[PDB]
A paper describes a structure:
We study the molecular properties of the membrane protein KtrAB—a member of the Trk/Ktr/HKT superfamily of transport proteins that shuffle K+ and Na+ ions across the plasma membrane, closely resemble K+ channels, and underlie environmental adaptation of cells of plants, fungi, bacteria, and archaea. KtrAB is formed by the KtrB membrane protein and the KtrA cytosolic ring protein. KtrB is responsible for ion permeation; each KtrB subunit has the architecture of a potassium channel pore domain, consisting of four M1-P-M2 (transmembrane helix 1-pore helix and loop- transmembrane helix 2) structural repeats (D1 to D4), which embrace an ion-permeable pore. KtrA binds to both ADP and ATP, resulting in a low-activity ADP-bound state and a high-activity ATP-bound state, respectively.
Residue numbers in the entry:
A (entry chain C), B (entry chain G), C (entry chain A), D (entry chain E): 7 to 140, 149 to 282
E (entry chain I), F (entry chain J): 15 to 445
The structure:
Amino acid sequence: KQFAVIGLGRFGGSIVKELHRMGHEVLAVDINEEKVNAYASYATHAVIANATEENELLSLGIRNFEYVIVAIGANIQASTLTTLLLKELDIPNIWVKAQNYYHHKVLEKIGADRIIHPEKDMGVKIAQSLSDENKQFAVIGLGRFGGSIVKELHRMGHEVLAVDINEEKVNAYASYATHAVIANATEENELLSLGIRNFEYVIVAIGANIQASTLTTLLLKELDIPNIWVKAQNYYHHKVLEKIGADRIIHPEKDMGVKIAQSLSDEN
Amino acid sequence: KQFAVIGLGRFGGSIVKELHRMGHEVLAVDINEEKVNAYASYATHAVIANATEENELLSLGIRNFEYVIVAIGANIQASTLTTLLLKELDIPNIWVKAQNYYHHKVLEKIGADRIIHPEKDMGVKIAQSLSDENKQFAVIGLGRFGGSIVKELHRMGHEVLAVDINEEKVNAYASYATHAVIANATEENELLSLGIRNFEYVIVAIGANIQASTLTTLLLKELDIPNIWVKAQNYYHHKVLEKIGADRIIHPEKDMGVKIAQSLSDEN
Amino acid sequence: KQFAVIGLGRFGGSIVKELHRMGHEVLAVDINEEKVNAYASYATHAVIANATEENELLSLGIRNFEYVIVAIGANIQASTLTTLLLKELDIPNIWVKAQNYYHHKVLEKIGADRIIHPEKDMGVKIAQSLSDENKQFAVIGLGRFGGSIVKELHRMGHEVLAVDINEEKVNAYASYATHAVIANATEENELLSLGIRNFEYVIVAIGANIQASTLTTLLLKELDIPNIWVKAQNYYHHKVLEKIGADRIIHPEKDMGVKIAQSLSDEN
Amino acid sequence: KQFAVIGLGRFGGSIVKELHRMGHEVLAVDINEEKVNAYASYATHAVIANATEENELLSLGIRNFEYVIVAIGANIQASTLTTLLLKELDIPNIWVKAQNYYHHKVLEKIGADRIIHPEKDMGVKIAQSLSDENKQFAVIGLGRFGGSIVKELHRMGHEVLAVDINEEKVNAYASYATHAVIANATEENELLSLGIRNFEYVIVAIGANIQASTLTTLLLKELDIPNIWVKAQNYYHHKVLEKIGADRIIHPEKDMGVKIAQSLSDEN
Amino acid sequence: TPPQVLAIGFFLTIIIGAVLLMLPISTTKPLSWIDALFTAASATTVTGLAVVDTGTQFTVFGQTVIMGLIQIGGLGFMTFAVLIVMILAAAIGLKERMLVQEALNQPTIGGVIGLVKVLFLFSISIELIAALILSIRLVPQYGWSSGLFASLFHAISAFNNAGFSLWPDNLMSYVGDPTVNLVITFLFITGGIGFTVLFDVMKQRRFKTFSLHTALMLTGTLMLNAIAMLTVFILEYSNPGTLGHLAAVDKLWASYFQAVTPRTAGFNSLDFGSMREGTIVFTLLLMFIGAGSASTASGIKLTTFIVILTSVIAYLRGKKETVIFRRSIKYPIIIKALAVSVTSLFIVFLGIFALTITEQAPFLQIVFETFSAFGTVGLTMGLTPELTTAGKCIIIVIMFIGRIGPLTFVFSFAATEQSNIRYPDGEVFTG
Amino acid sequence: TPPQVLAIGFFLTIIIGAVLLMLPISTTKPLSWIDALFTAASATTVTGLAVVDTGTQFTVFGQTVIMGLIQIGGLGFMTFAVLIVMILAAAIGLKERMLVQEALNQPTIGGVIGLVKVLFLFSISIELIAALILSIRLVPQYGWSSGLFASLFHAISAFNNAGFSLWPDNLMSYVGDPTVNLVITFLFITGGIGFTVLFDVMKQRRFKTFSLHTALMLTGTLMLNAIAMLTVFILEYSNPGTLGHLAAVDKLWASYFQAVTPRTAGFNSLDFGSMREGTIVFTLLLMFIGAGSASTASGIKLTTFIVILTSVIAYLRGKKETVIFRRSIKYPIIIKALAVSVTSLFIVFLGIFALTITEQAPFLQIVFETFSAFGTVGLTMGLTPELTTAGKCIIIVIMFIGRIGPLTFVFSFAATEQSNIRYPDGEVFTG
Ligand SMILES: [K+]
Ligand SMILES: [K+]
């Protein structure tokens, strides 16, 4: 019944927006006000505060909330200390957004009732969408997301043509995919020589350099790729990728929040 | 009759390709071979050499060519020294691609029979295409190209809403346009507040950062801008900008070469 | 009696070296082997292992050690998770090297029997050395170290001419020093205009850019500054600063380890 | 009798300062005023102007000067166009500072009565100082300067242990020195293994990264190297290198100007 | 909203109160419709002017309702609106926290509800102990029916910088009274200095640990007063009318008080209608510049002056920046200072202009009246009683605009416009 | 140096000239040592004040030497020092080019020698053709001994904005003279607008291609005059003393001229000693703000006003920057404007203060005299002749400081200090 999300990042913001949509009270709150302002009408209560300060957690009657969500990215200590303080107020169910592997472990020994990996957990879901969607699978960009799909699909037992720009990643994924390949998705001859045309499902998970994500999907749409799924970064990336011909765009942080906002709702 | 183009850059390449099309002998030649290879069937004679070396100019019977074209970009000294050597062989008409203003002057005292500014000279032509095309004119990005259009259109006597990201340029163009504005074409409120919607002809000349060129045209197409003309950088930029809704795309270097390839042809 | 130091950084290395000197058993151990190698004869037992793995902590009979030292810098999670695992093996007294403020808090709720701030805790000691050393005090570079001296000296009740390159820090130290000044120690006129010549004790705590630390001390020695104390980074910094005329050089990480290696010794 | 130096760079500044010292009229002049200001009492006439503009050359009665010096570095076109304009006013003897090889050629076809390579021409002089100074020769850093010494000394017939950080240069100097070696002067084992201790004359010509120049000389002085000659960059580099034990410091740009200021004086 | 609320809101306390006194109970002689909406506005603005006398015209009902109006604005309009929600209810969100941040000049909103208790409570604190105790020391003369009241009525007016005196002789009767000059001055002085300097010196209490602002006030405050006592004493020394013939000690109680009362105090130790022309001048400027920010009334707070002036003192030299007490002053403070500066003047000028024609009165008095009117100074060269009707409505606006501050007042009916696009440089000379 | 030179230099033309007229040849009646170093300083400053009448007291020698002094400063002090090195010699380095860049308000030094010829030559150009031709049209009445001179003497004073009239009735005799009001107004108006707007409109001549500054002047200049003629006409309409009884057409020649003469013109179409108090007021402000930068005289040039005011108008709204004619105004122009603004006031106040005690005169006249004195306006409520000695020395400094501009004047004895080190933020309220 009592919902409160700390940290209005892309993830923490996609939960205060979804829960409010469904019609559930959401005590949104972030460190600064820049975000807290845009979410003044996206939550039951928009508050500007720092989750590391005790008096701020108390004064906000945060103790009445059975479901606390620590979505503060970056500064891991911010994510930790918060969950740490939360577990002290005997918060029933604390859900936290971990960054790396160790964040998972540490947050697990603190008392985190649940940890979510936006990039990771999403890939597995997509790896489930591509499977129930039909044969030829290929994922470009072995980032955290693109890596969680080559790992999941291979698990299920589906051919996955994994491939990233450098080899550092392609090496660790030599036995995590049907075919590990080191190449650059922007070069034509490399896309052709890789018989990428035989793949009905192409996944552009290359983060950072948006142009890399775009140009790739651009080249892909030229080879008449049946269904191209791409990982967009910001809003505009969505638009541009949509006019290119992207058969599907995924927002790891965004799309995940809505799912959690559904897990916290059906949880009571 | 005798045609020879030095430097197979984007410009020097659009001339060896065009002249060969018309059916005129073209002694294409660049410093390295990377380009000279792709132009083996795009010119009467593909040669790999350095225009600064004497023996290489002589051995290539370059003296028999009445029309020499120095399109070697970058290293200005390469462009200069070449024209310098050329003028020594009493080359009838030497046409050279100047980079900056001073390049114009120096190349003029050397004996350059003709100097071309791909970016500059092209803008004036477009400024002529937009004029004979019909009222509301606005050019985004005051680069060399975008600056040669706000200067020409204002000359003709047409309203030009000049505007660039910073102010450094917008300042020098305060009396070169109906309205000099300092703004960023990626921000919505800035496009709206500038009543950019009343302009039937928008010109995105922002070079470098392609995304800047794209996103802008993207926003423009949203305001239902009648005719949006954009300056593309590379091939892919052409494609992507074409799927966005760009009413027209211009390649300063490319489109200019074809025109010159027409000036050298009708010149004899 | 049982001593073991995890993480052979500059700090963790200055403790395994000092304790072994005194004649105390030291179970040195770092993640990689690069360091563990050079410390094969600097500790009772040099071991290559990762403090986050359980089986590695157990197999190393780490449970028999009453004094565990987590000096692993950088990756805070490494520092945390370790102390976390340590507190599970009921380690009597766990001493950990915290990085930032929050690291202090979190490490405090885990069970850290002691936390040390190499940069911070050292400054206070020096602020005690400069006080018992005699009037005019001035500290350049408000880093973590240079900031812990302007704060301590002002506490005792001594004039402190705090001053850093930018203003970001100089602002937070407006009421933490007799005089907060924003300036660059490399410029002469700025050193003069600040009457820095009247200061018998100058402290160059500017980290990072060694040249900044050097050139400053260099300029300082020219104004015939009585006693110039400088914060050296690496070994060579020590040498070069020594030939310049540095009246005193301090290694926050190094010099602190020896002190702790003295606290652990006299502690039993 | 009539002396005028254009471009107050490090070189052009060491000539207006030296000639004025001797007691000769010097029409100092640079593009901006920043330099022209500090040289108001270092020349018969300090003028702020641009050598590319005609009216500025005329209005400055530059035609009355028999000796014009174009020391404007960087923008080669500035160095060229100037000499170009100068040769038009029938300037008796125009001396210009060339940057690279091609600058030499082009400036030679313009009419440059003399071209000087500060870095190059200086090395040959030093290569003459080290020769008449006495057996074991070794030059570190194959920059333009360090390269003009390994080339000159080998010419005379003296053993030269050439050596630079990378191999790119060390390759072209395989037959330009008694022993071409690829190494980093900051590493000890590399200095020892190269029997550098047997060399009575070590030359640190590594430009850029001053620390490289310093640390090296620092290590050198430790091996008790008889006479260490180092290439300093700025003023402070001089001081610091002087307190390290540098048996000699050379300022390619500076020391050369004084020599030229001696050539122009004895030239009439 | 924060601005408007203090605009139209403070406007009602004047109207409502303009009838709370125009009532047959508080008025002996007929109170014309004009001389009623005035005197009621002067007290609420803590200005010090009145068409009709005080202690006389008004009964014990018209003298008590004046203390209530002189208190309302004595701390601001929102300083009493957030105190009626904590002693009767409790708990207040970030919706009302943005209102008292505009009635006491505060750059912070996240914490202005809890203070509400302290301010008013602390108000009636130093107001009682310094009035009914230290001011009833030498005033019990008139008995208890006029000694108990007259000693409590002037404190709520003294500490609040009001200028509303009971007896017709606006304190003019106590020329050299040691208790008066000492007791009342301490009231409007401190009560005059921004609440900051008030609160600051309290918990800080350190001779050095005083913030730029607080540290400023004390210096400028005292320092200036010295230049004030020196001026009044040098010009009104031989003046046979006032001070000129007073003894040796009584001459200091006049120069001092008269050099401290222009600080929007409103008390007369002598008479301004009989002093060297020069003196009156220095005053127009001495009353123009109020005293303190959070203060308790003023047209252009002392701080503004210092900044504007000193900031210019730096220009004439070279300092690329305006640095005070080795704690430089950011750029913003400059522009705002200028704004608040030119505004007060631009307006006061509009008044001096819209009055010289409205009523046939001298010029010196027409200018002295305006400056004092916009700065709620209280000192009147004897033109307040003889103010026509036409010149009243407008004058009522002056005091209204002056007390409400030219800035926080203009933000109300000012459609805030946000420019997102920059423009080309605009060269222009002014030397 | 650039500043000092114009400071102590312009100071000598006043002294040397104060003896060029005190000579028995140019003075009929004895010219006291006091009323000699004054009238000679008023003409050189082109101020419009004089202890002794003009056309009378002075002979043909005391009326010719006045036109020479009214010309010297009519273009600046360094506008005549670089004109004696090109017509007699030629060639000038970058050493003297930095002096005329401070006497005509120029942000450039690399080119102020060549112009020297044009300025003065162009001066005596419009001064002759508009005086001996258009001003000798309706003045040949007094014959050739007084019709030829009287028509040339007023132009060197009209175009230069001087206020020095021949006949005792400072043009007051020509109330509705079409030639006078039309001829002389065009002289001090244009001569008044900065040399820029003068030179600009010349080669530019385009209705749009006028730089920010130039474009400004024209608008503000004319626009303001409209508010000026409207003011003087509405207040002095029924005034039986002046204009009030003039016909229908003669009422416009008074309102117009009187609304254009305060621009440091110095001519009287009527009498300021007999006009509604309100009118005189608007004037103090209308004469405070001069007219144009490069102009020919003024205390605080029009431009400064616009900026300061408008800049504030932007604050009350929101525009993060002060943008004019869609050509934003850089930050610097703001601070300097403020400086020049507060300076003129701070000083004029020091005068109005140091005069009310020096001489027993009315207050309205003591303030009108000061503003006019610092802005070399020429209009005097009839107190100039009755100026005591004590109030003269100081008054001579006013006109001196005003004409020399408060900025370029303060840079002389101002030890320029350069701060290289920054300091911590300094919070301070002022609302
Ligand atoms: K008052
Ligand atoms: K005048």
